[PDB]
Design a protein around this ligand. Structure first.
Ligand SMILES: CCCCCCCCCCCCCCCCCC(=O)OC[C@H](COP(=O)(O)OCCN)OC(=O)CCCCCCCCCCCCCCCCC
Ligand code: SF4
Ligand code: SF4
Ligand code: SF4
Lengths: 305, 178, 93, 379, 143, 155, 68
């Protein structure tokens, strides 16, 4: 049974990541007025397998070389375990903290790659990206520490029974405007993808692994938003309906990422760290204090079963 | 009649309303959202893409691609070794070696080109007083070796005997302009 | 046992992928960075102090938790503003 | 001091760094030198144009035009009105092409890559026009001394009108994305800030000047063609930043249509190549019937048309600036020296001063402003 | 106002030779668009026109399976277009041969030829001239 | 059988290396505007599973476009050595096939085929993006006509 | 046009919908029509171990009622 469930949780998400690469290519093409892949197969549903075969065909410290990508991918996959859809695979109180930990770790891979590659050129960008990722994960954590006071438990099931009536966006949107952005930094996506913008050491295989984990994290952060700030409908007789609406909103966010990647330019590193340290951190602290006071100058102090 | 960009007609105001609009555009990102809307617009449009092997782009009879010597309707060639193409070819590409012909007439024995040097300009078909050589429309003659591109008299003759069903009309249309 | 199974499965899958990859074919300092890492620490420690609110709130001394939270946040912001004014967030060397 | 190299992602730079900011930027030119001015001397005046198309490869026609004008100032002749007007037309179209490529490569090297793909369709349209007229897409031999090669086919003007009817909307739809985006404003503002005295000294030209308040346009001044007839307002900027330069380029994109409208609505009938058959070849019907015209055909196309010993220095308002030509000549068809003057040269000479104190990812925006093309530079 | 589009789509589907022809096309040339047929070369190449689309796409062509002893169901070049149609196909004119045929001349290649890149009937260079310098042909007797 | 399915496997892996093509667009000069026009909408390089641009270490094909001088040769050979096997090449233009209009000059490599090998050639000054696509399809076919597994299994 | 992305959108949709219903139906098949109980505390775990002890089968998905 359990192995069956883990397969259902791991194989389809890899399939979806591949077809997500596809969807990216297609939407970017349609926004740049071109088509996109329409040839390898009907409307381009084989280009991903083509890329996989090609990469695994390409020729090339083994310790770091292997542990880094493996580590990143394993973390990205484990991140999925504790999610409710609607009843989760692993119900863990403190699940979102487990999420944050396993999302922050990959910095170790990013850093080992650099410390191995003697290239000063490589350490340059490695340090830069590591610092930006760290600094944005900080706020990624504080936002949850400021919202979850609405449900006095770090669980991920209580979110649903909370949002039963209303969502979590009509309030807290001063945060969603952030949690929908830091997610564009930890992922090193645009407009913060400088780590892939300024180039002057990832082989084919490890590059495939890095990219797999990157797009997995994309899907997963979008799902986290759809669960936290966009509460679905939990009518207990319709777990199917829950999963369906969740799918819809996840796809919507994953296409918003692409609207962004197409439209905007990239941020200059200094301008970016300025953005964070001088626009989001003060607001973040003040809004956390606000949501700390709310359940005191209002009866809305929630329970802990 | 000069102008002025990036400059206000005068000093601005400190109106609370203007500060309010500024603050809004700095917080909620109106302009960025407008850009997203524009991208959405172009998403919902028709793409200019085309299937190449089954649809090929537009052109005009004046193209300049693969080369082609030519003939009269009576089978005879048109080149008579006037060498204008050689003396005008900016690249010095062409190589000619002429001779008599057993029938007494004047003709060639070597008219070689290097399509690696030919910049595809048009001067040879401008100079040739008999319209013999005509840089043609065929642009699909990419190859796999650097010796299928040192064309000679016989390859040019074959290309002419092949494409002459098109160059006739192209020129019949274009010559008046020149 | 369940998380053990899942993690071993994920690791073994990744290693199958990498083994496939390998078989199928056949510097000065910048004080700013250290300062940024230090800011990151001195904020993670605040986070460790600050997480327990979802259980510190259901107690009876609201007049105490409210206060201590405000205190931590405001003094941290004071330190931040001092770092700013003394140019730890400028990046121009 | 972390001194490093920098290339593509031709542009070989050596950065003398200090931490994250810059201390010096030494370019290493010469990766695109061939021997243009060492070949020309071994050629005539009619198998040289290709060189001037390949130079500043984007426009190519505001360059053929410079060569033609130099040869004409030497030969003491003028071309006819239809030729002058056609030539203005294609000059403006090339202004548009070069401005488009500069803008979009700027935004691309930055990361915004949609307007590139958008405007390239209209660029393909312009190339369709180049094809209908010349025969080839880009490197047309169209503009030539003594006038022009062939007249205009009977299906062009309508197309040009139908294209100008929409280029403005496309420009506005790109402005909506860029000219207000705080991100672009912050990538460009206060970058490449320059002062007028140092610009003049370093030898800057065109936009790098009139974005610093100066009033210099070699079409209003030193008018080389009918440009004295039509109206076109020159833009300038007061600050002197990449933003002002960008806005100058766009405003010129627009004034170019303000020109094309009048070029169209006033294009007269007439000839194309001056009827002095010792200089420009004649029509083929006469080349075939008459005799003297055939002799002149032969001579033109073996021994280029003789030129009297003189020397000049012309100039154009190409998309960038003072595209100049010092053409020396003996009493022979084979010239003696053809010195190009391309602004990229001085732009690089001023890069080391515009990039003193700014960060690492602003050199790219500087270069975008400078619209660096290397064909014109290496020579 | 969507059922009009849906009906257009279904008649687009059925326009081809049933499911079999639809599959041949939609897997060889990734299009389904339906349009008039005006000409058909001797090899099998079926041309098509639809003057309600934009430029460059208002004409198109379905190639031939086998062309000059060859299996070209998948393998498909752009040189398999004979000239008297090539001209129109590339937007040079507006009248096909059926209303604008060429000059009926001899010495013209009847059986057109696909590209000859690496085939055993490819092209090579050589000289088209005799020997400039002759030489001495010594005798065949000792003194 | 064995040889049958071996041929089929080779055909499939060629399917891969034929669709998932990634270029390094080493475009030095005015044979570059045409690569860009090709990756533009009206021909859409990507349509054939061929990305606009990408770094060498993860690339498969390498498009040379422009005069190949004696100062940018070393860098080019360095890149072609760094790239990972297999590595296919495509020369795009006169300047890079035979030195074009600059053959007889002193600071040109009279043919990129001296520095590096070649699998495809394309003429032009410039070419037409359509001819460039045709060259790339000739390349796809020069791939699809390979029999590595057969030659190994009969080595 | 834009109606050519559905053959990837629907794919991702189904392959993100499968895990949820998979988990739900599987938990239900195991624990007999009722979902999998959860223990955020020792209380619920005591209840579960009690039901296990009294199941007569040593499995907790059995609710007895009043016929014991
Ligand atoms: C009780 C409640 C109290 C009242 C609270 C009112 C609402 C609070 C709003 C909180 C959100 C604040 C976000 C923000 O302030 O971003 C500012 C930032 C500009 O910051 P800065 O680096 O200084 O540059 C500006 C120079 N003019 O702007 C930026 O430049 C950010 C650029 C973001 C780029 C990503 C855009 C993504 C757009 C997605 C939209 C969401 C869907
Ligand atoms: S087209 Fe120009 S370069 Fe080519 S052979 Fe003719 S004259 Fe020479
Ligand atoms: S110009 Fe024409 S006739 Fe004269 S040598 Fe050249 S090809 Fe022959
Ligand atoms: S062959 Fe012509 S178009 Fe290509 S790089 Fe050389 S000069 Fe430019």
């Amino acid at each position: 049974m359990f192995f069956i469930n883990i397969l259902t949780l791991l194989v389809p998400i890899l399939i979806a990541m591949a077809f997500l690469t596809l969807v990216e290519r297609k939407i970017l093409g349609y926004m740049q007025l071109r088509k996109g892949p329409n040839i390898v197969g009907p409307y381009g549903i084989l280009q991903p397998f083509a890329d996989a075969m090609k990469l695994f065909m390409k020729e090339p410290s083994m310790s770091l070389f292997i542990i880094a990508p493996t580590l990143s991918l394993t973390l990205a996959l484990s991140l999925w375990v504790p999610l409710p859809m609607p009843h989760p695979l692993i119900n863990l109180n403190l699940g979102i903290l487990f999420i944050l930990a396993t999302s922050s770790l990959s910095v170790y891979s990013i850093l080992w790659s650099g410390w191995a590659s003697n290239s000063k050129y490589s350490l340059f960008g490695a340090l830069r990206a590591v610092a930006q990722t760290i600094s944005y994960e900080v706020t990624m954590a504080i936002i949850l520490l400021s919202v979850l006071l609405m449900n006095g438990s770090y669980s991920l099931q209580t979110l649903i029974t909370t949002q039963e009536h209303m969502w979590l966006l009509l309030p807290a949107w001063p945060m969603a405007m952030m949690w929908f952005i830091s997610t564009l930094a930890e992922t090193n996506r645009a407009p913060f993808d400088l780590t892939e913008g300024e180039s002057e050491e990832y082989a084919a295989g490890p590059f495939a692994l890095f990219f797999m984990a990157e797009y997995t994290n994309i899907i997963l952060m979008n799902a986290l938003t759809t669960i936290i700030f966009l509460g679905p409908l939990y009518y207990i007789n319709l777990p199917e309906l829950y999963s369906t609406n969740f799918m819809m909103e996840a796809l919507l966010l994953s296409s918003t990422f692409l609207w962004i990647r197409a439209s905007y330019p990239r941020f200059r590193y200094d301008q970016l760290m300025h953005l964070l340290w001088k626009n989001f951190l003060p607001l973040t602290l003040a809004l956390c204090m606000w949501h700390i006071s709310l359940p005191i100058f209002t009866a809305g102090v929630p329970p802990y079963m | 009649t000069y102008k002025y960009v990036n400059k206000k007609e005068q000093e601005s105001e400190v109106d609370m309303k203007s500060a309010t609009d500024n603050a809004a555009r700095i917080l909620m990102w109106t302009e960025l959202i407008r850009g997203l809307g524009m991208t959405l617009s172009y998403l919902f449009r028709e793409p200019a893409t085309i299937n190449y092997p089954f649809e090929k782009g537009p052109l005009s009879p004046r193209f300049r691609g693969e080369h082609a010597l030519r003939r009269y309707p009576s089978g005879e060639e048109r080149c008579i070794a006037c060498k204008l193409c050689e003396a005008i070819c900016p690249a010095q590409a062409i190589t000619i070696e002429a001779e008599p012909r057993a029938d007494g007439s004047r003709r060639t024995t070597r008219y070689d080109i290097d399509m690696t040097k030919c910049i595809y300009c048009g001067f040879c078909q401008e100079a040739c007083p008999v319209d013999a050589i005509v840089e043609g429309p065929n642009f699909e003659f990419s190859t796999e070796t650097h010796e299928e591109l040192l064309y000679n008299k016989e390859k040019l003759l074959n290309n002419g005997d092949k494409w002459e069903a098109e160059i006739a009309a192209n020129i019949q249309a274009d010559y008046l302009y020149r | 046992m369940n998380l053990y199974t899942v993690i071993f499965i994920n690791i073994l899958l990744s290693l199958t992928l990498i083994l496939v990859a390998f078989w199928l074919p056949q510097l000065p300092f910048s004080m700013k960075f250290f300062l940024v890492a230090i800011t990151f620490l001195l904020f993670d420690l605040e986070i460790a102090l600050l997480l327990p609110l979802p259980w510190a709130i259901q107690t009876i001394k609201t007049s105490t938790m409210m206060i201590m939270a405000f205190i931590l946040v405001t003094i941290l912001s004071l330190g931040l503003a001092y770092e700013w004014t003394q140019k730890g967030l400028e990046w121009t060397e | 001091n972390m001194t490093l190299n920098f290339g593509p992602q031709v542009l070989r730079l050596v950065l003398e760094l200090s931490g994250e900011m810059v201390r010096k930027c030494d370019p290493h030119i010469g990766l695109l030198h061939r021997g243009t001015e060492k070949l020309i001397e071994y050629k005539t005046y009619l198998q040289a144009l290709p060189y001037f198309d390949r130079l500043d490869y984007v426009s190519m026609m505001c360059n053929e035009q410079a060569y033609s004008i130099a040869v004409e100032k030497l030969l003491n002749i003028q071309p006819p009105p239809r030729a002058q007007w056609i030539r203005v037309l294609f000059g403006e179209i090339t202004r548009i092409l070069n401005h488009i490529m500069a803008v979009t490569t700027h935004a691309l090297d930055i990361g915004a890559m949609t307007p590139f793909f958008w405007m390239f369709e209209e660029r393909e349209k312009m190339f369709e026009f180049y094809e209908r007229v010349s025969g080839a897409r880009m490197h047309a031999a169209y503009i030539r001394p003594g006038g022009v090669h062939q007249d205009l086919p009977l299906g062009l003007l309508d197309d040009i009108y139908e294209f100008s009817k929409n280029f403005s909307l496309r420009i506005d739809e790109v402005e909506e994305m860029l000219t207000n985006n705080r991100i672009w404003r912050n990538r460009t503002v206060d970058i490449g800030v320059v002062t007028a005295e140092d610009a003049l000294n370093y030898g800057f030209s065109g936009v790098m000047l009139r974005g610093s308040g100066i009033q210099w346009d070699l079409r209003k001044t030193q008018p080389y063609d009918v440009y004295d007839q039509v109206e076109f307002d020159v833009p300038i900027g007061s600050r002197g930043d990449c933003y002002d330069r960008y806005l100058c380029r766009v405003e010129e994109m627009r004034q170019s249509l303000r020109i094309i409208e009048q070029c169209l609505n006033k294009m007269p009938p007439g000839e194309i190549k001056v009827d002095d058959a010792k200089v420009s070849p004649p029509k083929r019907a006469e080349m075939k019937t008459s005799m003297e015209s055939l002799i002149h055909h032969f001579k033109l196309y073996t021994e280029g048309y003789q030129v009297p010993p003189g020397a000049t220095y012309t100039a154009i308002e190409a998309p960038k600036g003072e595209f100049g030509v010092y053409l020396v000549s003996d009493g022979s068809s084979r010239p003696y020296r053809c010195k190009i003057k391309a602004p990229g040269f001085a732009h690089l000479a001023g890069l080391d001063k515009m990039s003193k104190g700014h960060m690492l990812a602003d050199v790219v925006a500087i270069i975008g402003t400078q619209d660096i093309v290397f064909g014109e530079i290496d020579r | 106002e969507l059922v009009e589009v849906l009906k257009r789509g279904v008649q687009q589907v059925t326009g081809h030779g049933g499911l079999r022809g639809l599959l041949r096309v939609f897997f060889r040339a990734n299009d389904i668009r339906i349009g008039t047929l005006v000409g058909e070369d001797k090899y099998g190449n079926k041309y098509y026109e639809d003057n309600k689309q934009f430029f460059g796409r208002h004409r198109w062509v379905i190639y031939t399976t086998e062309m000059n002893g060859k299996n070209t169901f998948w393998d498909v070049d752009g040189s398999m277009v004979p000239p008297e149609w090539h001209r129109w196909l590339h937007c040079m004119t507006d009248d096909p041969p059926t209303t604008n045929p060429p000059t009926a001349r001899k010495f013209i290649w009847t059986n057109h030829k696909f590209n000859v890149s690496a085939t055993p009937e490819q092209y090579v260079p050589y000289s088209t001239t005799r020997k400039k310098i002759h030489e001495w042909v010594p005798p065949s007797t000792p003194y | 059988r064995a040889e049958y399915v071996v041929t089929k496997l080779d055909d499939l892996i060629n399917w891969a290396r034929r669709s998932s093509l990634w270029p390094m667009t080493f475009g030095l000069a005015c044979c570059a505007v045409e690569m860009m026009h090709m990756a533009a909408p009206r021909y859409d390089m990507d349509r054939f599973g061929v990305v606009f641009r990408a770094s060498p270490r993860q690339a498969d094909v390498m498009i040379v476009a422009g005069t190949l001088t004696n100062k940018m040769a070393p860098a080019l050979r360095k890149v072609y050595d760094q790239m990972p096997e297999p590595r296919y090449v495509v020369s795009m233009g006169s300047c890079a096939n035979g030195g074009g209009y600059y053959h007889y000059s002193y600071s040109v490599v009279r043919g990129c085929d001296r520095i590096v090998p070649v699998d495809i050639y394309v003429p032009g000054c410039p070419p037409t993006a359509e001819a460039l696509l045709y060259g790339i399809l000739q390349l796809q076919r020069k791939i699809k006509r390979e029999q590595k597994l057969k030659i190994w299994y009969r080595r | 046009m834009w109606f050519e992305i559905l053959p990837g959108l629907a794919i991702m949709g189904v392959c993100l919908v499968i895990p949820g219903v998979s988990t739900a139906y599987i938990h239900k098949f195991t624990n007999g029509g009722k979902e999998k109980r959860v223990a955020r505390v020792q209380y619920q775990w005591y209840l579960m171990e009690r039901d296990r002890r009294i199941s007569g089968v040593n499995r907790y998905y059995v609710s007895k009622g009043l016929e014991n």
